[PDB]
Symmetry: C5
C-alpha cells in the first residue's frame, strides 16, 4: 500500500556503523553491524496532534507501508532487527533498524603491505507506480562510533555520495547510494615478521662472496633460498590471486633473482678456480661483494619508486 504522491518520493537514508570486523583480504569482504535510518512523507497517515493521542505515533512495520531498501553488494539477505518506527504529525515516518551483514567490496593490493582501501555499501530501491529516489540525511550518517574496530586497519573516514545513481533496471527505475568506508592498513607487523626476516636471509645468502668453499657456499646460498620460499609461501597465502602485480610480490620475486645470480657466481667462482685461473675467480667474488647489494638497493629504489612514487 504505497504512499500516494504527486512526484518521485524521496526516502532519506543513513548508516551508523556500530561494529566493524572480519575484513577478509582473501575473500574481499568485511562484516559490518550498523543502524539503518530511513524516512519519508506518507501524508496518508498524518494525525491531528491535539485531536488524538500524542506528539508522535508508534507503529509496527506491518501497519505502515515501508520501502524495500536492499543492500546491493551483500552475500546474503542483510540481517536486520527493527529498532523503532515513529510517524510524525505531517505524515512523516521515522524508521530505524539495526542490521548486520557481510559486505562484498573489492580491494587493491597493488601496494599490498602499504595499501589504503575504500570499502562500499550500496542500498538500491526499486519503484512501483510512484518512483523512488533515495538520498542521505547526514545526521544519521555520522555513522561510525569512536569504538569502530577493524583489526589491523586504521579507519580514516565514513562518508557517502550525496547524489544517488538512478538506473533503469528491467522497466522499473532503481536508485542506488554509495556509502564509503576509507581505511589504511596497519603495515608494521609486516616488518619484524616478514620484511626484516626476509632481508636478513638474503644477506646471509651472499655472505658466500667472502667464502671459497663451494661445499659451504651451496650449503649457504641454497639453504637461504629455501627460507625465502617459506616467506614467499607465507605471504602468498594471506593474499588473493591478483591478475596484476603486488608490491611485496615484486620484491619477493625480485629477490628470487638475487639468489639465482648469487648461485651463478658461487658456481662460476669454481669452474674457474678448478680451471687453474683463480686470477679471475677471486676477482669476480670480490666484485659481487659490491655489485649485488648495490644492484639490489638500486633495484629497490627503482622498484619502490615504480609503485609508490608514480
Amino acid at each position: 500500500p504505497p504512499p500516494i504522491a504527486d512526484e518521485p518520493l524521496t526516502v532519506n537514508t543513513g548508516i551508523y556503523l556500530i561494529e566493524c570486523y572480519s575484513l577478509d583480504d582473501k575473500a574481499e569482504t568485511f562484516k559490518v553491524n550498523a543502524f539503518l535510518s530511513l524516512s519519508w512523507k506518507d501524508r496518508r497517515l498524518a494525525f491531528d496532534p491535539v485531536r488524538s493521542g500524542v506528539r508522535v505515533k508508534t507503529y509496527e512495520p506491518e501497519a505502515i507501508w515501508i520501502p524495500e531498501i536492499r543492500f546491493v553488494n551483500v552475500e546474503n539477505a542483510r540481517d536486520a532487527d527493527v529498532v523503532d518506527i515513529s510517524v510524525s504529525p505531517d505524515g512523516t515516518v521515522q524508521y530505524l533498524e539495526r542490521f548486520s551483514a557481510r559486505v562484498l567490496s573489492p580491494l587493491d593490493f597493488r601496494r599490498y603491505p602499504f595499501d589504503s582501501q575504500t570499502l562500499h555499501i550500496y542500498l538500491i530501491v526499486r519503484s512501483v507506480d510512484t518512483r523512488n529516489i533515495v538520498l542521505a540525511v547526514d545526521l544519521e550518517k555520522v555513522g561510525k562510533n569512536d569504538d569502530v574496530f577493524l583489526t589491523g586497519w586504521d579507519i580514516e573516514s565514513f562518508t557517502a555520495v550525496v547524489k544517488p545513481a538512478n538506473f533503469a533496471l528491467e522497466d522499473r527505475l532503481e536508485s542506488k547510494l554509495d556509502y564509503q568506508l576509507r581505511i589504511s592498513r596497519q603495515y608494521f607487523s609486516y616488518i619484524p615478521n616478514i620484511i626484516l626476516p626476509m632481508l636478513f636471509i638474503l644477506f646471509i645468502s651472499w655472505t658466500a662472496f667472502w667464502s671459497t668453499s663451494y661445499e659451504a657456499n651451496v650449503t649457504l646460498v641454497v639453504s637461504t633460498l629455501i627460507a625465502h620460499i617459506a616467506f614467499n609461501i607465507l605471504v602468498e597465502t594471506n593474499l588473493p590471486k591478483t591478475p596484476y602485480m603486488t608490491y611485496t610480490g615484486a620484491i619477493i620475486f625480485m629477490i628470487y633473482l638475487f639468489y639465482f645470480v648469487a648461485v651463478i657466481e658461487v658456481t662460476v667462482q669454481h669452474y674457474l678456480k678448478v680451471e687453474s685461473q683463480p686470477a679471475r675467480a677471486a676477482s669476480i667474488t670480490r666484485a659481487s661483494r659490491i655489485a649485488f647489494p648495490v644492484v639490489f638497493l638500486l633495484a629497490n629504489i627503482i622498484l619502490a619508486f615504480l609503485f609508490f612514487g608514480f
Copy 2:
C-alpha cells in the same frame, strides 16, 4: 490454484547477475547474487483498467498463484527475497525476486593456469495439470552488471540457451533452462609466484653440470628438488583431485624427472671419476650442460603443444 489454460503455459524467465564471487576451484562451486524475472498470463485475474484502480495491480505472493521455479544445481534452497509483483490488465503477471545461492557447476582444469570456464545455472519447473514450459525473456537476461566481480577471473559473457529441455521426471514433465556464464582465468600471478620460481630452482639444479664436487653437487641437485616439492605441494593444494591430467601437473611432474636424471648424472660423474676414467666423466658432464636444457625446452614444446595446440 494454477491458471486454467488451453495449452502448456509458458513462464518467461531472466537473470540479472548483481554480484559474483567466491569461485571455489577445490569445491567446484561459486556464489551468485542476481535478479530472477518470471512472467506468465493468468487471464484469471485480468482487471478492467478503467472500471477499477489503475494501470497495474500489486499483489503479495500469497494472493497470486506463482510457479515453483527451483534452481537445479544448487547446494541448498536458493535464498530469495521478493522485489515486486505486478499484474497487468490482460491477466499478465510480472514477478521479480532477488535470490542469492551458491551454484555447483564443474570446471575443466585440463589447461589449469590457462583455462577458460563455462558455469551453469539451471531453473527447472515441474507441472501439475497444465504443463509448464519455461522460456527466456532477453531484456531481463542482460543480467550481469558492469561491476560483476569474480576475483581472479575475466568474465566473458552471460548468455542463455533459448530452447528449454523438457524431460519426463516421475510421471510429471519438467522444463529446464540453461544459463551460461563464460569466464577465462587470470593466469599471471601464477608466473612470478609459481612458474618462474619453479623454473629458477630447476636451473640452479643443473648448475652442477659445471661442478665436480659430489659433496656440493648433491647439496645442489638435492636441495633444489626439495623446493620443487614446496611448489608441487603448494599447487596441488589449491586444486581438486582431477581423474585426468592437469597442464601444470604435467610440467610440475615432467620436472620431477629432470631432477632424477640430473641426480643420475652427478652420481655417475663420480663412480666414473673414482674409477680413474675421468676421460668419460667430464665428457658426460660436458654433454649434460646441453642435453638437459634442450630436452627440457624440447619436451615443453612437445608438452605445451600436446595440451593447447591440439
Copy 3:
C-alpha cells in the same frame, strides 16, 4: 489427525539425487540435494471425481495429515521445501519435497588412495496409534541424475534396501530404510602428486650407495628424509585419525625404515672405513645397492598383497 486404518499403514518412499558434493574425508560427511517422494492411502479424503472438481486435488501441507519422515544420520534438521501434494480419488496422497542436508556416513580408509565407498541415507518414522511401515517405490528412487557430481569420486550406483528395519524405540515402533550410494575414489592425482614424488626422493636417498663422502651422504640421505615428512604430513592432513592402518600410511611408514637403515649403512660405511678396514665397507655399500631396492619392491609386493590381495 492421522489416517484411520485397519492395519499398519505403509508410506512409500523415494529419493532422486539432484546434486551431490562436498564429500569430506576428514569429517566423514557429504552433502546431498535430492527429491523426497512419499505416498500413502488416506481414504479419509477420497473425493468423487465426477461429483466435484477434477482428476486430482492439490493440498497445502497444513490441510492433509503428513507422516513425519526424519532422516537418521544427519547433522541438523534436513532442509526441505515442498514441491507438490496431490491427493488421488481413492484417498491416495502424492507428496514431493526437495530437501538438502549434509549426511553423516562413515568411510573405510583401509585402502585409502584406492578405496571404494558405500554412503548411507536413512529415513526413520515413528508411530502413533496406527503403526507406520515405510517402504520404497522404485520409480521415484531411480534418484540420481546423469549429472551427479561428487568431485574426485566415480559414482557407481544409487540403490536401496527394499526391506525396512522396524525397531522398538521407546514404547513406539519406528521403521528405517537404507538408501545406498556406492562410490569409488579417483585415485590418480595421488600419483604425480604423492606416490611418484614420494618414490623419487626415496631413490635419490639411496644414491648414497654409490658414494663414499660421509659429508655428502648425510647431506644426501638426511635431506631426502625431511622431504618425506613433507609428504607424510601432507597426506596425514587430508585424512582422519583411523584407529586402524591405512594403505598409504603403511607404505609411507615402511618408507620411514628404508631411511633409517639407509642412514645406518652410510654411517657404518665409515666407522668401518676409518677403521682401516675398507675391505668390508665397500663390500657392504656394494651390497646395499641391491638389498635395498629389492627388499623394498619385495616388501611392497608383500605389503600391497597384504591389503588388496586378501
Copy 4:
C-alpha cells in the same frame, strides 16, 4: 498456565543420544543429537477415557503448559523439534522432542594421547509459584544407540546422576541434572604418525656418537632437531593451551633436552679433539653411546610413571 499442585512438581527427564560427533579438542566442545523425554502430572487435564475420545489425547505444545527445560552448558539455544505430546487419563503428560545442540564440556589432557574423558549435559529448570524438581526416568535415558559414532573415541557409558542439584538462583530455585558421557580416546594413530616417527629422528640424532666429523655431526644432530619442531608444532596445534602439563608435552619437551646435550657432546668432542687431547674425546663420545639411550629410557620410565603410575 502452570499445573496447580500441592507440592514441588516433579518433571521426569531422559536423553536418547541418536548421533554424536565433532568432538573438538581445541574448543572443548562436542555436538550431540538426541531425544529429550519430559513427563509430569497435570491433573488439570485428566479426561474420562470412556466418556470421551480414546486412551490418550494428543496436544500441540501451545495447548498444554510445558516446563522450560534449558540445557546449561550449551553454546546457543538448543535446537529442538517436537516429536509427540501424549496426555494420559490421570492428567499425565508425555513429551518428546529431538534436539541437537553443541555442548561445552571440559576435557583433561593430562594424559593426552592416552586420556579418558567424561562429558556433561545439564538441563536446569527454573520455578514459578510451584517449585520444579527435575528427575531421571531410566527407560528414556538408555539413550545412546548401537551406532553412536564420535570419531577417534571409544564410548564407554551414557549414565546420569539420579539426584538433582537444586540451587537458589535469583530468588527462584532451579533444579539441575547431570548427564554423563564417558569416553576413552583411540590413541594409536598417534604412534605410526607421531610417537614412532618422533623417536626415530631422536635415534638418528645420536648416531653422531659413532662419528667424528663435526661437519657431519652438526649436519646430523641439528637436522633432526628441526624435524622434532615439525612434530612439536604438529602436536601443539591440535591441542589447547592447558595451564598444566600434558604427557606428550612432557616427553616432547624432555626430548628437546636430549638434543641439547647431544649437541653439547658433539661440540665438546671437538674443542677437545682440536685440543690435542683425543684421549678424552673418544672416551666421552664412547660413553654417550650408552648414557643417552639409558638416561632417556630411564627418564621415560620416570616420566611415564609420574603421569599414569600415580
Copy 5:
C-alpha cells in the same frame, strides 16, 4: 505501550554468566551464555492481591510492555529465550531471559603470553517519551558460576560499573551500562612449547663459538635460524596484527639478531683465518662465547624490564 510515569523510569539490570567459552585472540571476541535480569515499576498493572488471583501474576511477553535492552558490542542480535515474567502487586515487573551471544571486546597483547584482560558487555536502551535509565541490581549480577570455564584463562572477577553512561544519540537519549569480565591468561603451556624450545635452538646456534669448521658452523648457525622461523611463524599465527609491539614479538625478534651477529662471527672467524691471522680469529670466537649469552640475558633483563617493570 510504555509505562506512564512522572520521571525517567529506571530499569534494573543483572547478568548471571552461566557459560563462558571460545575466547578468540585473533578475532578479539568471546562467547557468553548468561541470564539477563530486568525489572521496572509499571504501576499500570498493579493488581489487588486479595481481590484477585495470587501473590504475583505471570505474563507472556506480548501482554506486558517490555524495555528494548540491546547489547552494544555484539556481532549479531543477541540470542535469548525468556525464562519467566512475574508482575508484583505494586506494578513491579520481574523479567528473566537466558541469552547467548558472541561479544566483541578488544584485548591488549602488549604482554602477550603474560597478559591479563578486561572483557566488556554493554546493554544500551533507547528512550521514547519517558526517558529510560538503566541501573544494576547486584543480587542478579553475582552472575558467574563456580563452573565458569574459559579455557586457557584464569577468571578473576565479574563486576559492573554501577553508574550508567547516558548519551544523546539521534535526538533520543540512551543509557549504557558496563559489565566487566577480568581474566588473566594461563601462560605456561607457552614455555615447554614455545619459550623453552625457542631458547634451546638459540643456544645450539652459538655452539659454533667452540667450533672452527665453517662448513659445520653454517650447517650449525643456519639450521637453527630456520627452526626459529618455525617458531616465529607458529606464534605469529595465533595472534592478530597489533599496530604495537608484543612482548614475545620483541624477544622473538631480538632473537633474530643474535643469529645475524652469530652468523657474522662464524663468517669473520674465517676471512680472518684464511687471512693467515688466526691470531685474531680464535681471539674473537673466544670472546663471543661470553659477549653473546651475556648481551642476551642482559638485553632480556633490559627488554623484560621495559615491558613489565614499567
